[PDB]
Amino acid sequence: LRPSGTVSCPICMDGYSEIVQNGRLIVSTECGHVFCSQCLRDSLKNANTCPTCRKKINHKRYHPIYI
Amino acid sequence: RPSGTVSCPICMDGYSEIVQNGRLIVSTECGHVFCSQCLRDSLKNANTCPTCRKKINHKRYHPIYI
Ligand SMILES: [Zn+2]
Ligand SMILES: [Zn+2]
Ligand SMILES: [Zn+2]
Ligand SMILES: [Zn+2]
């Protein structure tokens, strides 16, 4: 069960209390999707995308300039 | 290499040599300038600015304190 209004990780399926009880943080992507710190971390070792919506959540900080 | 010269510190090509074969001039956010080809290469197996070593990979997630 995953009652609406509750904050849990869609990957490990832990609730808010379980996530914080062992030192993990609640995190959010810029695209608004919530995970525990540890599952999003593993996930991003091997992708630039949000587990939930697949939108890229990296930002190589460089860009063309047009002199 | 006088001030105002636009060139790549990696391949050593100047602004004309860069645009003539289809590369773009680029800049990291720390203000460092490369050709698009050399910078891109450097970032395949690394995530730092080839010039100053600052991390230039901004993964867009953060803690929320509830
Ligand atoms: Zn989790
Ligand atoms: Zn997302
Ligand atoms: Zn170059
Ligand atoms: Zn730099």
Q: What is the resolution of this structure in A?
A: 2.0
- Give the HSE-up count for residue A4: Cα atoms under 13 Å, Cβ half-sphere: 0
CA distance A45 to chain B (A): 11
Within an 8 Å CB–CB cutoff, is residue A34 touching chain B? yes
Three-class secondary structure of residue B40 per DSSP:
helix
Report the C-alpha dihedral over residues A65, B3, B5, B9, rounded to 10 degrees. Answer: -80
Q: Name all domains of chain B by residue range, CATH numbers in brackets.
A: 1-66 (3.30.40.10)
Maximum separation of any 2 CA atoms in chain A, in Å? 57
The residue of chain A with its CA nearest to that of B28 is: A62
- Round to whole Å and give the CA distance between A46 and B20: 36
Strands of B33-35's sheet, edge to edge?
A62-64, B25-28, B33-35
- Round to whole Å and give the CA distance between A41 and B63: 12
- Round to whole Å and give the CA distance between A54 and A31: 10
The residue of chain B with its CA nearest to that of A32 is: B61
Helix (H) or strand (E) holding B4: none
**Nearest to B35, CA basis, from B22, B54, B45:** B22
The residue of chain A with its CA nearest to that of B65 is: A26
| Chain A with chain B: Cβ pairs closer than 8 A | 69
Q: Say whether B25 and A65 touch across the interface (CB within 8 A).
A: yes
Q: B-chain residues within 8 Å CB-CB of A29?
A: 60-61
Q: Say whether A61 and B24 touch across the interface (CB within 8 A).
A: no
- Round to whole Å and give the CA distance between A63 and B28: 7
